[PDB]
Amino acid sequence: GKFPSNKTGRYFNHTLVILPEKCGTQITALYCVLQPKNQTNCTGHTTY
Amino acid sequence: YNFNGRIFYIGRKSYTPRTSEGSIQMVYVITANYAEGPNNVCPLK
Amino acid sequence: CIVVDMQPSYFQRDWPRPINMSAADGII
Numbered sequence: 798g799k800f801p802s803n804k805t806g807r808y809f810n811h812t813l814v815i816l817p818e819k820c821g822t823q824i825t826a827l828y829c830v831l832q833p834k835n836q837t838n839c840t841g842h843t844t845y
Numbered sequence: 846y847n848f849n850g851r852i853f854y855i856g857r858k859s860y861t862p863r864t865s866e867g868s869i870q871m872v873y874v875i876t877a878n879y880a881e882g883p884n885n886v887c888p889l890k
Numbered sequence: 891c892i893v894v895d896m897q898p899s900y901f902q903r904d905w906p907r908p909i910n911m912s913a914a915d916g917i918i
């Protein structure tokens with residue numbers, strides 16, 4: 798979908814994210830709902 | 846319906862899930878994959 | 891929360907490595 802700041806890259810339901818952790822020694826996979834936060838330049842408001 | 850910001854014309858129609866006496870009528874779909882490798886899933890004998 | 895700098899102009903150097911079929915690079 799679209800961000801409230803008219804940007805692109807928001808996923809509106811369950812997302813699968815693959816993250817490397819601990820200096821590239823662990824690979825994790827989270828299937829979680831990704832909610833935007835409301836902080837300045839932090840996925841909230843009209844400035845992003 | 847306004848999903849995500851897009852217009853979606855939908856339609857919902859209900860039905861009775863179970864009979865009068867209280868027996869739930871299920872539908873079970875079972876898909877079995879026969880592959881060329883070793884067969885893991887087995888019946889318990 | 892964190893002010894970052896986004897500038898894709900410096901991120902365009904190519905050094906391409908295309909797929910070589912004779913080595914089976916991406917064959918599953």
Ligand SMILES: *[C@@H]1O[C@H](CO)[C@@H](O[C@@H]2O[C@H](CO)[C@@H](O[C@@H]3O[C@H](CO)[C@@H](O)[C@H](O)[C@@H]3O)[C@H](O)[C@H]2NC(C)=O)[C@H](O)[C@H]1NC(C)=O
Pocket residue numbers: 889890
């Ligand atoms: C699938 O599951 C059923 C139920 O768990 C298994 O049937 C059970 O089989 C055992 C032994 O074959 C039975 O135990 C026997 O019980 C009688 C009294 O009921 C007792 O006198 C004997 O000494 C013995 O302990 C058990 O009753 C029986 N249960 C039922 C509900 O039939 C069945 O064997 C399983 N299939 C397999 C493992 O392939």
Ligand SMILES: *[C@@H]1O[C@H](CO)[C@@H](O)[C@H](O)[C@H]1NC(C)=O
Pocket residue numbers: 809810811
């Ligand atoms: C996707 O997210 C919306 C946001 O509320 C939710 O209503 C919907 O149920 C979600 N999709 C599924 C399949 O649960």
Ligand SMILES: *[C@@H]1O[C@H](CO)[C@@H](O)[C@H](O)[C@H]1NC(C)=O
Pocket residue numbers: 898899
């Ligand atoms: C991303 O950056 C490139 C590099 O200038 C640009 O050509 C492209 O239009 C940008 N895309 C978006 C969606 O901002």
Ligand SMILES: *[C@@H]1O[C@H](CO)[C@@H](O)[C@H](O)[C@H]1NC(C)=O
Pocket residue numbers: 910911912913
């Ligand atoms: C593919 O790899 C082989 C093995 O080194 C090499 O001989 C060949 O030239 C390569 N092909 C290309 C198109 O790079």
